[PDB]
Write a protein that binds this ligand. Structure first.
Ligand SMILES: C[C@H](C[C@@H](C[C@H](C[C@@H](C[C@@H](CCN1CCCC1=O)N1CCCC1=O)N1CCCC1=O)N1CCCC1=O)N1CCCC1=O)N1CCCC1=O
Ligand SMILES: COc1cc(CCNC(=O)c2nc(-c3ccccc3C(F)(F)F)[nH]c(=O)c2O)ccc1O
Ligand SMILES: [Mn+2]
Ligand SMILES: [Mn+2]
Length: 180
């Protein structure tokens, strides 16, 4: 299939993230060799969720994204049946042991207002916290509770702009922006 996008994704992202994104797409019936704009997106979403869980305490967060569909649901079942939190209708990305809430992490190429609105409309009940990031450095969280301190969030924003820069340098940012 070739694709300059696929070669950049493997050269830019972590091999474990590329493997986990590859498993995620094939689990849902999509091939990273054609859906290359997607391929770069789940890799970006995966890394952001991992940087997010790294922020704060060495514990604090339980990672839901990156697991198999069955295993990820088994964890939220244990989390709900232990803390009494209501079962989310859709698979979240993390769970905050410090704030007792699930987190839905979003990485968009639009403004943070639309993606939040689409995610909040799909999110069954506003119990699950929503945190949105953008490739332009913007961010938006539920009730302005951004969970982490400014330092950890600033690097996620910095890492996002480096990906956008490396992609525009390879003439791949235009097709990536007009695909979401
Ligand atoms: C070198 C360093 C490595 C990162 C790794 C970490 C991702 C993540 C790893 C796996 C564990 C694998 N499986 C398979 C199933 C059971 C299981 O456990 N998964 C994925 C699902 C949840 C999970 O646990 N882990 C492991 C420890 C905590 C964590 O989040 N992270 C976090 C930053 C980006 C990244 O990749 N580590 C290791 C600890 C410190 C650290 O940063 N890297 C790679 C590039 C950036 C970086 O620092
Ligand atoms: C069928 O679709 C996919 C579904 C999954 C499993 C669960 N998915 C998520 O948890 C999730 N996915 C995205 C995302 C990323 C790129 C394109 C589209 C989306 C989505 F908004 F449509 F879903 N962004 C998030 O923030 C997020 O939490 C895995 C891979 C899939 O391609
Ligand atoms: Mn997810
Ligand atoms: Mn998400």
């Amino acid at each position: 299939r070739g694709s300059h996008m696929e070669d950049f994704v493997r050269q830019c992202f972590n091999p474990m993230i590329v493997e986990l994104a590859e498993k995620a797409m094939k689990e849902y019936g999509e091939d990273p060799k054609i859906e290359t704009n997607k391929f770069a997106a789940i890799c970006t979403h995966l890394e952001v969720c991992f940087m997010y869980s790294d922020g704060g305490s060495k514990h604090r967060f339980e990672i839901i994204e990156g697991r198999d569909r069955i295993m990820a649901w088994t964890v939220v079942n244990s989390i709900c049946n232990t803390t009494g939190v209501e079962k989310p209708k859709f698979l979240p990305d993390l769970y905050d042991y410090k704030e007792n809430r699930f987190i839905e992490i979003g990485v968009t190429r639009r403004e943070v207002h639309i993606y939040y609105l689409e995610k909040a409309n799909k999110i069954k009940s506003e119990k699950t916290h929503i945190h949105i990031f953008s490739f332009t450095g913007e961010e938006m969280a539920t009730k302005a509770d951004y969970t982490l301190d400014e330092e950890s969030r600033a690097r996620i924003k910095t890492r996002l702009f480096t990906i956008r820069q490396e992609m525009a340098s390879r003439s791949l940012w235009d097709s990536f922006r007009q695909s979401e």
